[PDB]
Symmetry: D2
Subunit: 255 residues, 4 copies
């Protein structure tokens, strides 16, 4: 099942969409400058692009780390990003009451992994009618994502993206099960599946050569998109796009 | 470090405290009846007791599932439990705004495992000044528990209980690492450590008893369970736990 | 099901039996000196005792690190241990050909974990008629131990001990599932289960882990020393024995 | 580091080599038939090929289960495979004494995963001088493969292939860590790394393909496995492999 996001078609058999930006919104000037780098590299490679940032990050490394500019100013910034670049945007929400005003502006709203089971947030997200990105908890098996999907369906919204971020592997480590993508496709109605390579790695060419190997491996399984929590970018995306074009150009095996 | 909860002393070298009750509050009558059974059994065995229940089930499989009586009616029920039995009580919170009104009534407030990294909830819980029970996420190693502890300390509250509930083991399965208790004691200032045997089993009453015994053998402040154990096996179960706990606590550490 | 090993009764409802000694046999004088320490401590606490060592360590940190004295000398050392102390002994075998000559001397022979699925070794061990200790591979779930058991039974030997040594937990790391004991008891005919706390561990940690395991009601404890330091042995065993006495004195629920 | 196996160059920056055949040798006729299928498909796609089989099933469901033809007859069969098809072959060894006679015939000898820490087997394998395929135990981290490699080097043999076969993931289940390939390359001198996709998988055709593709996307020397299913599968692997090998490393 494909999902239309303005002029973008997101789907497991469509060219991959890149989801990328900054961690937290600080200022309009800072945001536009970063977004302009992503936009210029992606436009030049012809890769569809969705800008990501948090306006209010509830899951911070420290208590007093900056949460972001907040709902009101954040949504202003996002409006400016959409107007200047003509691209869709994505942001996370952690409180039910935030969902509706965020959804007036943000094309995709994101369910953080740690809140993925919180029924009230699921419901309030669903009721926006917006495209939703469901982050897979590291403790949830791929065959149980269908239960989160079910709850969104009960609450009236089927425009759902499934985002892999790795699975708990002993202590501390995360491993990404390359079979999980296929399990999610088979059990969740072939909804678009995207890969958050960055998180998948935070606990493991340095990080750069690893991110590339892991992104390649995941995209080889035929996925709707790639999600980075962030010329260097350009070399990376050239390789991802090469693999993605090859894979998507071949028909799926046939019974 | 010991923590005082009314007349109870909770600590890794003190007699074990039982945190027990029901999953979700449904009615006043049901709750008082169950609580009376726990109270009568624990008082006769001489085991300190804290009554546990949730006023809300925040992650049901269905949006249409029964979720509990809710904050307002739930706190009423907890006030009645405290007035009738004179015991401390414990319940979980899911939203920052709930922390203060819950803490006015509930002696111990609990950070659910899924929310343990919701920084705003941590901060709002800490500011209550109440005793807090931190449920260890199944994806968090015992040597990183100190990071949650740090955050509570930075926000001004050192009255923290660490609650083991098992660790992710492949898909859909939990294992309890009996070495984790010691790692938590060593790295988190010997704060009280308690064992949630019930949730620790959930992926799998002979097994609860074996697992509870194993955990208490490592010398713990408390045991945390639901009744899930059938309610009339409770007295026989606790007789065995208390026997082991008395033996272990009577031997000096080294 | 209990198993008789000379005058010892080994069984999940019997006082725990200590299986203890050294990693690899390196000399006669030093083996006897270590064994004497075990024997004096265990006799003083009234704990039944089986001396353990390998004559040939197959998985060494380096290729030329010493394998041990070897089969011929190793069996002579074990005969000396049995003559001097009158206690049973246990050792591992790696090759089918070694089974017979080892079993003539040793009261228990041990199937190493890495070889536990080698059908020829299983068959040759079984055919000795000896008591066998089956080391649980770290990659094998407790509900699959029954398949090793089955193969021993097909080959004619039901005098089997099951030995827990932990399970792979992510990379390079072991966790002991305290529910695995019960699963093995339930699926393998309540054969004696013992706990190798030493190999499970990679201390105050050894003691905690040993206590936790023995709290689940087991036939025995399996450990090494030099690994626990040899003079803390008595203090360690006093605590194990206290817990084991308490647990075994209560009827099963 | 590349390894020459007759006319084949095996190496992490070379076209992938398929290691394929049957589980256990049963008879000359059914072995030749299966081998001929692999040979005809690989030749027609232009993929280098090494035939694999065991002469002995070391872990059998029953003591009475069929075990395979055994060393003597098994080596006869391998000689006939080499003579008829002119390809290298690979088989596993379980006992030190078997190493030399197996190595006389078999181009590559394989160290099974369960025996990978059996030092006497390591030493006897090493002393053959043959190309060795080291099966990575499901309980061993990728950063520890270097310790096995070190032992083979101390015993005088650097012609080693590292073979990924998945890692224990809870009970009774495997997962393949796609970062492990790179860790092994970086810590073990860039020795050839291959991927046993078949054993890594504790319908099923779609899974093997996804997993094989994911692994070969990390740039590997080879792939190891057991209406036209093989060819349709290898067509896709070879497409990916050609793309990945044509891009320079960064
Ligand atoms: Cl998560
Ligand atoms: Cl004997």
């Amino acid at each position: 099942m494909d999902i239309k996001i303005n002029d973008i078609t997101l789907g497991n058999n469509s060219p991959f969409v890149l989801f990328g930006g900054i961690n937290v919104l600080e200022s309009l000037d800072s945001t536009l400058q970063t977004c302009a780098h992503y936009v210029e590299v992606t436009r030049k490679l012809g890769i569809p692009y969705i800008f990501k940032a948090s306006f209010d990050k509830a899951n911070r490394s420290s208590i007093h780390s900056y949460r972001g500019v907040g709902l009101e100013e954040g949504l202003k910034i996002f409006e400016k990003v959409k107007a200047e670049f003509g691209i869709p945007v994505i942001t996370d929400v952690h409180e039910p009451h935030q969902c509706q005003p965020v959804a007036e502006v943000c094309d995709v709203i994101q369910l953080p992994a740690f809140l993925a089971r919180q029924t009230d947030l699921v419901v309030a997200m669903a009721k926006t009618g917006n495209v939703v990105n469901i982050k897979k908890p590291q403790g949830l098996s791929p065959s149980q994502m269908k239960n989160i999907v079910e709850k969104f369906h009960e609450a009236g919204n089927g425009k759902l993206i499934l985002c892999e971020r790795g699975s708990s592997f002993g202590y501390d480590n995360l491993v990404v099960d390359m079979l999980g993508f296929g399990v999610m496709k088979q059990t969740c109605g072939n909804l678009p599946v995207i890969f958050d390579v960055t998180h998948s790695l935070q606990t493991r060419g340095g990080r750069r050569a690893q991110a590339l190997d892991l992104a390649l491996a995941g995209m080889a399984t035929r996925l709707a998109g790639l999600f980075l929590e962030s010329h260097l970018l350009e070399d990376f995306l050239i390789r991802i796009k090469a693999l993605d074009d090859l894979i998507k150009s071949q028909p799926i095996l046939t019974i």
